[PDB]
Amino acid sequence: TKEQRILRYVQQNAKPGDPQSVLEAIDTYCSEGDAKGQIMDAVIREYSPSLVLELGAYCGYSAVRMARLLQPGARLLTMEINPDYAAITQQMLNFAGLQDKVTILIGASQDLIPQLKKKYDVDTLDMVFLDHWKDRYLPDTLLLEECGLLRKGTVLLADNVIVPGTPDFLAYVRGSSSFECTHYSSYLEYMKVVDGLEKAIYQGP
Numbered sequence: 001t002k003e004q005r006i007l008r009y010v011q012q013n014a015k016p017g018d019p020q021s022v023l024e025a026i027d028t029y030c031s032e033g034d035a036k037g038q039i040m041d042a043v044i045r046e047y048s049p050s051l052v053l054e055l056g057a058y059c060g061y062s063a064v065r066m067a068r069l070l071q072p073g074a075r076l077l078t079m080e081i082n083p084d085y086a087a088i089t090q091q092m093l094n095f096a097g098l099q100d101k102v103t104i105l106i107g108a109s110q111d112l113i114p115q116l117k118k119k120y121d122v123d124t125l126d127m128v129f130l131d132h133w134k135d136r137y138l139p140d141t142l143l144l145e146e147c148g149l150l151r152k153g154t155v156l157l158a159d160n161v162i163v164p165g166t167p168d169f170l171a172y173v174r175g176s177s178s179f180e181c182t183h184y185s186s187y188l189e190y191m192k193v194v195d196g197l198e199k200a201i202y203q204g205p
């Protein structure tokens with residue numbers, strides 16, 4: 001119901017066609033995530049990806065956040081396992097006026113990623129945002145590589161990466177010469193990490 005409540009709140013209080021007011025409505029409602037969203041913004045602005053893959057949609061906050069910065073021609077593919085969330089996310093994107101920039105695929109990442117080239121005509125991806133299941137971060141990273149979907153300069157950005165969580169994913173991207181890594185730790189006013197993200201840029205084979 002959390003995702004449903006968030007949407008209705010947006011629908012009642014936000015301005016249609018204005019992604020900023022949609023995001024502000026979501027943030028405001030949830031607090032009584034801008035640190036993470038701010039990092040997502042910085043990555044999109046720096047790498048200027050033409051095709052983005054998002055793993056996990058939920059209420060659509062991140063789809064809105066990323067798609068609003070893509071220029072004409074640039075697109076987002078969003079995978080979401082839960083059809084109820086995919087519906088919420090579609091409504092959220094319609095509300096923000098970003099529906100022409102995003103395609104939502106319903107299903108499990110491990111099933112859909114291998115079908116991207118043949119079934120959905122993807123060549124390579126410029127950016128991947130990982131925010132789905134944490135036990136899939138490393139397997140899906142490997143799957144993307146092995147399916148030939150990454151190129152030199154493709155940026156992976158993974159949410160909710162806080163040690164000792166995601167030991168395998170981090171061991172790989174850090175450990176491998178094929179990835180150049182940056183970590184982000186948000187503490188807000190605290191001494192303990194509230195959210196962590198990892199940026200990993202593929203260097204090619």
Ligand SMILES: Cc1nn(C)cc1-c1cc[nH]n1
Pocket residue numbers: 055056057058079080081082107108109110131132133136
């Ligand atoms: C996409 C996807 N694939 N798998 C395995 C989980 C998801 C997910 C998790 C939250 N939303 N969607």
